[PDB]
Amino acid sequence: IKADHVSTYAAFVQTHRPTGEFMFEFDEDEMFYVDLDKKETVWHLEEFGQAFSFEAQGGLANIAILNNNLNTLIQRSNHTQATNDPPEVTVFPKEPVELGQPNTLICHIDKFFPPVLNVTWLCNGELVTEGVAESLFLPRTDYSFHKFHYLTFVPSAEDFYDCRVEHWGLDQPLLKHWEAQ
């Protein structure tokens, strides 16, 4: 559009899986969201939380409003379901890899629709249960989605990792290899 900066509330609502999301971003970075169960605003960086606030109801209301709009467009669309757009996946570390030295692996899952998606990390082929975090489902300009999972870890030559992904646009579950190159 030619702007210096873009601040956008982005919300979605669907029958499946994660049934609703309400968030706000600054130049593409999620700043806060409304947790629809806890009913509270979560700030992305805590230093944010100590300066600004947002009235959570403003988020629950917009959700209710989007379900009405969902119903109204299931009806008028003639029940059109979208084709399954498959994820493209990259995995990279947060810092220049240094052996024996604590780091964070990032898995960026991109260009997909809809935001119904299973993701797990594997270390030497085994499911990893701790040291693990995840982004919200993030909005995209072309109306597809992206997401980030994180794994904190100690880089080592004796070890490989995979981001393991599952989505209706994939025949098979998708794995991305990464190892101390």
Binding site: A3, H44, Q81, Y143
Partner: protein, 198 residues
């Protein structure tokens, strides 16, 4: 110091396994000291109607938008609320959020490594900075190098930090000094880190 909020509209008409999805966007753009508002209403990946404040009223993007653009553009009390946003919510939140956003400046960290085995590359890995705008340059015995230079796209870490990688293809002669230099707003002064090619 509370963030400002708009409600989306509630259309009349509420009047692989199955999945339906509804999306909305309420986006504020900020060109040199100004504010443009776009409100978008999307059904599975398909924007079908939109309010652009430049335009000034609703524009059906798709034939599914007709029942909305026509209804809502005879409804001026609603059409004015969309008209006032650029100078209420957009401007409120912009300058409110400023000191931790526009003013947010986190310094890059810089690492330089070879890549001769597996050509002959040198890798300038720049990590943990905000904001995305940055400039990474390569120098050979003081002289800038354009040729043989591949910078990745800008990489978004997802946690309010970016990283970027700029490599240079090279062939060290003898007493050669290669320098990678980084220009970023977080820095009063551009940062440099060297490779001695003895």
């Amino acid at each position: 110091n509370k963030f400002d909020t708009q409600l989306f509209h509630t259309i009349t008409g509420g009047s692989s396994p199955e999945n339906y999805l509804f999306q909305g966007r309420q986006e504020c753009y900020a060109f040199n000291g100004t504010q443009r508002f776009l409100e978008r209403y999307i059904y599975n990946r398909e924007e079908f109607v939109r309010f652009d404040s430049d335009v000034g009223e609703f524009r059906a993007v798709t034939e599914l938008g007709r029942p909305d653009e026509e209804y809502w553009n005879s409804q001026k009390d609603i059409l004015e609320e969309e008209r006032a946003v650029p100078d209420r919510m957009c401007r409120h939140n912009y300058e409110l959020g400023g000191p931790m956003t526009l003013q947010r400046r986190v310094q890059p960290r810089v690492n330089v490594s070879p890549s001769k085995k597996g050509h002959n590359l040198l890798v300038c890995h720049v990590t943990d900075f905000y904001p995305g705008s940055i400039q990474v340059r390569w120098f050979l015995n003081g002289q800038e190098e354009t040729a043989g230079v591949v910078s990745t796209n800008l990489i978004r870490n997802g946690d309010w930090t970016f990283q970027i990688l700029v490599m240079l293809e090279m062939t060290p002669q003898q007493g050669d000094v290669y320098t990678c230099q980084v220009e970023h707003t977080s820095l009063d002064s551009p940062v440099t880190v060297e490779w001695k090619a003895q």
